[PDB]
Amino acid sequence: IIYCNRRTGKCQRM
Hints:
By secondary structure, this protein is mostly loops. Helix content is 0%, strand content 0%. The protein is elongated. It is classed as antimicrobial protein. Keywords: structure from cyana 2.1, peptide binding protein, antimicrobial protein. The assembly is monomeric. The entry is titled "NMR structure of Thanatin IM14 in LPS".
């Protein structure tokens, strides 16, 4: 639970 990637449009804490 940090922050989702605005580039790929996905998240990093799924």
